[PDB]
Amino acid sequence: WESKPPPPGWRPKGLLVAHLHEHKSAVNRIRVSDEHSLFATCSNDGTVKIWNSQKMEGKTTTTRSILTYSRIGGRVKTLTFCQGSHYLAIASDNGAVQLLGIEASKLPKSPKIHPLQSRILDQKEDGCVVDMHHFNSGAQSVLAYATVNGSLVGWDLRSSSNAWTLKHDLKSGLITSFAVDIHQCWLCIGTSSGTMACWDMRFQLPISSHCHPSRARIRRLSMHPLYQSWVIAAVQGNNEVSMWDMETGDRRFTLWASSAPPLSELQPSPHSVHGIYCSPADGNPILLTAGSDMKIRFWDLAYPERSYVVAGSTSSPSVSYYRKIIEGTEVVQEIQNESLPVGHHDIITDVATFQTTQGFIVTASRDGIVKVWK
Amino acid sequence: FEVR
Amino acid sequence: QKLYSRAQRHQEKKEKIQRHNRKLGDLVEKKTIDLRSHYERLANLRRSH
Amino acid sequence: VEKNRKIVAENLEKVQAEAERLDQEEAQYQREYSEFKRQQLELDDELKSV
Amino acid sequence: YIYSCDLDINVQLKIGSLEGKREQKSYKAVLEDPMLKFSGLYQETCSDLYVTCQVFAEGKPLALPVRTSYKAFSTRWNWNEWLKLPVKYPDLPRNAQVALTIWDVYGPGKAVPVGGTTVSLFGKYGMFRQGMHDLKVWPNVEADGSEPTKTPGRTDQMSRLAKLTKAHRQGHMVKVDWLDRLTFREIEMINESEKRSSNFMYLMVEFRCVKCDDKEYGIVYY
């Protein structure tokens, strides 16, 4: 799930660029620019911190957020970089939506273009939004926004019509996670009512045959490079990273690390990992997912123990990860092995990285922690 | 903090 | 009728999740208060040292 | 027979409408459940981050 | 694609069955006059009728009330026949509207056609259809053929199903074949809802493909 899949052998290392705590409240929404070298930072304080890699890295007096705009209000926990739309969509608790051309402040110190497109979505049907993704094809600009309350619809950034709607997955209920096909094939929605749901991208056909029966929360989505009919997802509890065959609609993949047994009914381990990043390389998918255990996760399938990851906990001997084959699939069990705490001290959720034979990665916590790893 |  | 049974189950789940949401919000408030208290204690210790 | 048939057609339309209304109510209830569960998850995540 | 001018050929087609059932049996109107009982449907396991079909350019007549030959529908109205209307291809091609009726005894003294509807000869964009265009019935009423046609036959849930099926079958589907099977399965449910829908009259109108490109050719007037 990344352009120019890299060669095998990806392992992490102990380098970083900068750290920030500017966001007064928790930050749970970031956007990474495509045409440029910048990424967006927003916080539960209803304020968004814009950070430019070129400037924020160093060689400057202060690496403060370039574009800090709080006119949205509420809690800003929804942001996205519109695909070739020269607009940035932002969402806040108060059922409102914004699509601003804040890039207007690039060269001079001038007011950032307020939301070129904005809307206060229905408080009951959609609230403001739970999901929002824009589709770019040059000729048309279509962005798809989902709300926590079961509802899925798209909004063309260059069109007034908003008929692109997906009938609420009522059985799915909660709508807080969705997956996207790389070629606009189909979408899957991460929910928490136990059941899961999938959507098509050609005809937007609703396909609800996925689930984690325990009524578990699933907010993580990436396209499983292993099978176009397979997807990559992360769910809360037991440090779960599983791949689900949505035809069966259940996850069949593991890195088992949890007090809970595999697919444990009680899930004795409530810890999990999220913010997964997908790319095909080294004979299997190569992923970097935010480990809610604060385990900076550079994850491997064939040799998870053998490879190297960005996580901490130096007290653990050489990386320990179990590789198995279970009922037609290879199963993995993840097993564990003055000063100042370098690692984040909050519930880390977001990760973003850039490199070319070398580069940097961005990390954050559940309160505003900023970790810019090199 | 405030990065002035 | 089948769909209605499923929806009633999902609605009971919604009510339970909302109760847990209120509980988790109160708990997060207490945790943030504790974190602020720890930061203030660190402030005082740092000032003394 | 015609009274029965008219009542039957009216009740079939009414049943289809009731099913659609129940579907809409269920979609709204799933939206509300989504909001409540998202609140629960965010509150737990915030307690954990704190 | 083709220009209409060159051909100017007379009208011909095939026959198809009307979806609308004879639930239009004028229960009270039956309670009034004794003739109606003589209705072919009234007295047969099914209903044959005397076909009438014509084309009018926005209401101006341009052909004759074409009627099919003697065929059996008093037990099954399955129409497997052809008909040649009296309208030339270029004849009043602009704004031409296919209006028709079927003559079946509204009574022993009332044997005539009381079913009619009007639809443009070409499509909503101008392309002619030489393929079946099932028509919206106007029971107890006959066709008019005017541009403001009062009984539309040819140009939503069923609409969405049909449009999506047309788009997909045009060759607009990705290498993920599984949807097409599920596509038809769910089109089955949509059609089930549409059929459960009642208090409506319909007809299957099968425009005969032309052996000029040998298809339901899309002709545009010129």
Residue numbers in the entry:
A (entry chain A): 970 to 1306, 1322 to 1358
B (entry chain C): 395 to 398
C (entry chain C): 149 to 197
D (entry chain D): 201 to 250
E (entry chain B): 9 to 163, 170 to 236
From the paper:
The Unc-51-like kinase protein kinase complex (ULK1C) is the most upstream and central player in the initiation of macroautophagy in mammals. All forms of canonical autophagy, bulk and selective, are initiated upon the recruitment and activation of the FIP200 protein and the class III phosphatidylinositol 3-OH kinase complex I (PI3KC3-C1). While ULK1C and PI3KC3-C1 are both critical for autophagy initiation and recruited at the earliest stages, beyond the presence of ULK1 phosphorylation sites on PI3KC3-C1 subunits, it has been unclear how their activities are coordinated. We also show that ULK1C and PI3KC3-C1 form a physical supercomplex, determine its structure and show that ULK1C can undergo a stoichiometric switch leading to the recruitment of two copies of the ULK1 kinase itself.
Two-dimensional (2D) classes of the ULK1C:PI3KC3-C1 supercomplex were visualized, in which the distinctive C-shaped density of the ULK1C core and the V-shaped density of PI3KC3-C1 were both clearly observed. The peripheral regions, including the FIP200 molecule binding with ULK1MIT:ATG13MIM and VPS34HELCAT (helical and catalytic domains), were not modeled because of their high mobility. In contrast, the regions containing VPS15HSD (helical solenoid domain), BECN1CC–ATG14CC, BECN1BH3 and the FIP200 arm not bound to ULK1MIT:ATG13MIM (hereafter, the ‘proximal arm’) were the best resolved parts, with local resolution at 6.84 Å. Two main interfaces were identified between FIP200 and PI3KC3-C1. The first interface is formed between the FIP200(166–181, 473–485) and BECN1BH3, a well-studied Bcl-2/Bcl-XL-binding region that regulates autophagy and apoptosis. The BECN1–ATG14 zinc-finger and the BECN1 BH3 region were not visualized in previous PI3KC3-C1 structures; thus, it appears that the presence of the FIP200 proximal arm induces their ordering. The VPS15HSD adjoins FIP200 sites 1 and 2, forming a large pocket with the FIP200 proximal arm and ULD.
